[PDB]
Coordinates of C-alpha atoms in Angstrom, one line a residue:
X2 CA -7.8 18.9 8.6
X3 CA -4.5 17.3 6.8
X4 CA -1.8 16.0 8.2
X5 CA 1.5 16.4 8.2
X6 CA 4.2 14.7 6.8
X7 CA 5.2 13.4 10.1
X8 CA 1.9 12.3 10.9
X9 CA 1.5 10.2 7.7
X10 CA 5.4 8.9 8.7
X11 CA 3.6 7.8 11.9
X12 CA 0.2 6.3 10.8
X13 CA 2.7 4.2 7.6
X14 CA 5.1 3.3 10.7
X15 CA 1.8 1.4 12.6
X16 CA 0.6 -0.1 9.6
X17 CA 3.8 -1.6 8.2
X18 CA 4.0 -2.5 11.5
X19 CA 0.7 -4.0 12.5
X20 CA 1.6 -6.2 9.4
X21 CA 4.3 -7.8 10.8
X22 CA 3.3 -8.3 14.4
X23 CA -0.5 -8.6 14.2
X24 CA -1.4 -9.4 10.5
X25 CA -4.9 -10.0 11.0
X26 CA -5.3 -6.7 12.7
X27 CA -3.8 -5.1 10.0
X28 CA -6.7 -6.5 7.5
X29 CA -9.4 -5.3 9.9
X30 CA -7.6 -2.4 10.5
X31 CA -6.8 -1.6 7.0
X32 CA -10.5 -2.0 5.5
X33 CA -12.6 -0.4 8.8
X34 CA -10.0 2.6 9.8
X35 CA -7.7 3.2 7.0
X36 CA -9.6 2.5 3.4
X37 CA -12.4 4.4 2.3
X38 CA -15.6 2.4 1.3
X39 CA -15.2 3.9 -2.3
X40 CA -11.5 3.1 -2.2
X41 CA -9.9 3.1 -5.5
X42 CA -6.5 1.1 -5.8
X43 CA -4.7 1.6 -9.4
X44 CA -1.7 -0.6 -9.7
X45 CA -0.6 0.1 -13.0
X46 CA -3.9 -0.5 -15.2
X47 CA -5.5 -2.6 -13.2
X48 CA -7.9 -1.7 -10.1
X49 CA -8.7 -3.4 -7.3
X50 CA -11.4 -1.7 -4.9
X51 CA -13.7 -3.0 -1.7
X52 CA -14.6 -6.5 -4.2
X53 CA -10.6 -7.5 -3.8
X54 CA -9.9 -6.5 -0.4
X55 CA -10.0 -9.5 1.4
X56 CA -7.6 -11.4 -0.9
X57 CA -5.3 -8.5 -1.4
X58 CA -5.2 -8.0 2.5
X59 CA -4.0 -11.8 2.6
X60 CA -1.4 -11.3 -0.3
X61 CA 0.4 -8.4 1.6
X62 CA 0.8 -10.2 4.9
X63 CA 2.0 -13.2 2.8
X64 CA 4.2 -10.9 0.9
X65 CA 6.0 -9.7 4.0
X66 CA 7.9 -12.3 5.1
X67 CA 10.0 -11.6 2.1
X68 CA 11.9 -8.6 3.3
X69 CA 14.7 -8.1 5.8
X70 CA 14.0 -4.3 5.7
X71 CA 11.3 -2.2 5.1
X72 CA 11.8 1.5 5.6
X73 CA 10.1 5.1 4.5
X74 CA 12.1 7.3 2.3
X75 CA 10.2 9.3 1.2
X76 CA 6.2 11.5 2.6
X77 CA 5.2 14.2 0.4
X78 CA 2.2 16.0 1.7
X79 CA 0.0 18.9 -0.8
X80 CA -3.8 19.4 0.9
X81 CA -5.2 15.9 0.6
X82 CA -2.7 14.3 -1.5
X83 CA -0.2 12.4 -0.5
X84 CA 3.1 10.8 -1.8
X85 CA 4.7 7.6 0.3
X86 CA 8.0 6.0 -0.7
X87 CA 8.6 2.6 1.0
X88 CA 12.2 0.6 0.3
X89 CA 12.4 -2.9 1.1
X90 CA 15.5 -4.6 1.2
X91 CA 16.6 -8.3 1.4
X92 CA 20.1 -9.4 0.7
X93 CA 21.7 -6.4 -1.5
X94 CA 17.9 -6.8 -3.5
X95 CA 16.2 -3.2 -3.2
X96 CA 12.8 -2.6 -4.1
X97 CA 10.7 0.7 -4.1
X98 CA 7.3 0.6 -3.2
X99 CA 6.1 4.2 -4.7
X100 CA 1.9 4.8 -4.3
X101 CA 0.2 8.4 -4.4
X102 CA -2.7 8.4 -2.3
X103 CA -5.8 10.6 -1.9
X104 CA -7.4 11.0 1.7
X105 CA -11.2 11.6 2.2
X106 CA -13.0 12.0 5.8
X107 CA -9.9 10.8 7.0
X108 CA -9.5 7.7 4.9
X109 CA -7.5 7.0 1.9
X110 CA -10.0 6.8 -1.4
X111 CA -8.1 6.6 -3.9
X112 CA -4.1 4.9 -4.4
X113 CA -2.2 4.9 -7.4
X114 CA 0.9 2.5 -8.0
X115 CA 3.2 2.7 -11.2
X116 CA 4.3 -0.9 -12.2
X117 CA 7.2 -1.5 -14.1
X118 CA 7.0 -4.0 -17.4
X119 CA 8.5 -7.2 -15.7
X120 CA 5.7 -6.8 -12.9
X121 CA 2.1 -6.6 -15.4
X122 CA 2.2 -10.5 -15.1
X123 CA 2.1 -10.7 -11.2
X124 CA -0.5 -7.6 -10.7
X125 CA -2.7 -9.3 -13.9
X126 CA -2.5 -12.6 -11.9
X127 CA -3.5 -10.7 -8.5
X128 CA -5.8 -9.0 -10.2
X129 CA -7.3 -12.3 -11.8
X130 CA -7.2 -14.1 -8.1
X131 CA -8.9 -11.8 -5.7

């Protein structure tokens, strides 16, 4: 059974969400409901999976306070693969958060990020620190 592209819209809407009202819930949340075990996260060429998950979790709730806006442009559903564009604004700065995910048992297994060339340095460091 795969959902909809309103569904997805809904489950994105409670995460974003959760990570701005209950952040720790999010984490929990995030690595017992929404992550596969075998989860796969490819931002640009380097992956993070269940050994980085705990410090990632943390960087994305630190990470949020930075926006103003956060909204979904864009679900693309096709069987089990799923597209998800997220903007996020702060004064006249616009940023698109762009991942293609894969969903197994109803869990996300694998996500893959492009990163544009001014960004390697900050994903190598994240990738270095968690």
């Amino acid at each position: 059974s795969h959902m909809s592209r309103e569904e997805i819209r809904k489950v994105v809407e409670e995460y974003i969400r959760l990570l701005y009202t209950d952040p720790d819930q999010f984490k929990k949340a995030a690595r017992d409901k929404l992550l596969s075990p075998d989860v796969r996260i490819e931002i640009g060429n380097y992956t993070f999976d269940s050994r980085n998950l705990d410090r990632f979790l943390d960087a994305m709730q630190e990470w949020a306070s930075r926006y103003d806006r956060v909204e979904i442009r864009k679900v693309q559903v096709d069987g089990n693969h799923v597209r998800v564009e997220i903007e996020l604004e702060s004064n006249g700065k616009k940023w698109t958060f762009e991942i293609e995910v894969e969903v197994r048992n109803g869990k996300i297994k694998r996500i893959r990020q492009q990163v544009d060339p001014e960004y390697k340095k900050v994903v190598q460091n994240l990738w270095n620190n968690t």
